[PDB]
Structure formats: C-alpha cells, structure tokens
Amino acid sequence: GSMCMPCFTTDHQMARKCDDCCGGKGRGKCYGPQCLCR
C-alpha cells in the first residue's frame, strides 16, 4: 500500500521508527495511521 509501516499513537517513538522505515532522519512522516515516506 502507500504506507511504509503503520504509525501508532501509543508508540512514543513512532517518528524515529517511521524515519528508519523511510531510510533515515527526516525521511518519513506519520500522517494518521500511516508512515509515509516524504
């Protein structure tokens, strides 16, 4: 699908994980339930 991985509000480190999925610092955004690569 569009998302690299989910974003869950209950994971306080979701932003870091989403960046990891998307290849590093600043590369992913949590937008609602989806981590999307910028």
Swiss-Prot record:
Positions in coiled-coil regions: none
Domain comment as written in the entry: The presence of a 'disulfide through disulfide knot' structurally defines this protein as a knottin.
Organism: Leiurus quinquestriatus quinquestriatus (Egyptian scorpion)
GO molecular function, one term: toxin activity
Domain of life: Eukaryota
Expression across tissues: Expressed by the venom gland.
Role played: This toxin binds to the surface of glioma cells, and inhibits their proliferation without having effects on normal brain cells. In this context, this toxin has been described as a chloride channel inhibitor (probably ClC-3/CLCN3) by causing its internalization via caveolae. It has also been described to selectively interact with MMP2 (in complex with MT1-MMP (MMP14) and TIMP2), to inhibit its enzymatic activity and to decrease its presence at the cell surface.
SUPFAM superfamilies, per the entry: Scorpion toxin-like (SSF57095)
PROSITE patterns: SHORT_SCORPION_CHLORIDE (PS51200)
Keywords: Chloride channel impairing toxin, Disulfide bond, Ion channel impairing toxin, Knottin, Metalloenzyme inhibitor, Metalloprotease inhibitor, Neurotoxin, Protease inhibitor, Secreted, Toxin, Voltage-gated chloride channel impairing toxin
InterPro entries named in the record: Scorpion_toxin-like_sf, Scorpion_toxinS_Cl_inh
Main location: secreted
Name the UniProt record assigns to this protein: Chlorotoxin
Disulfides per UniProt: 4-21, 7-30, 18-35, 22-37
Homology family: Belongs to the short scorpion toxin superfamily. Chloride channel inhibitor family.
Note: Negative results: does not interact with MMP-1, MMP-3 and MMP-9.
Alphabetized Pfam families for the sequence: Toxin_5
Segment forming the signal sequence: none
GO cellular component: extracellular region
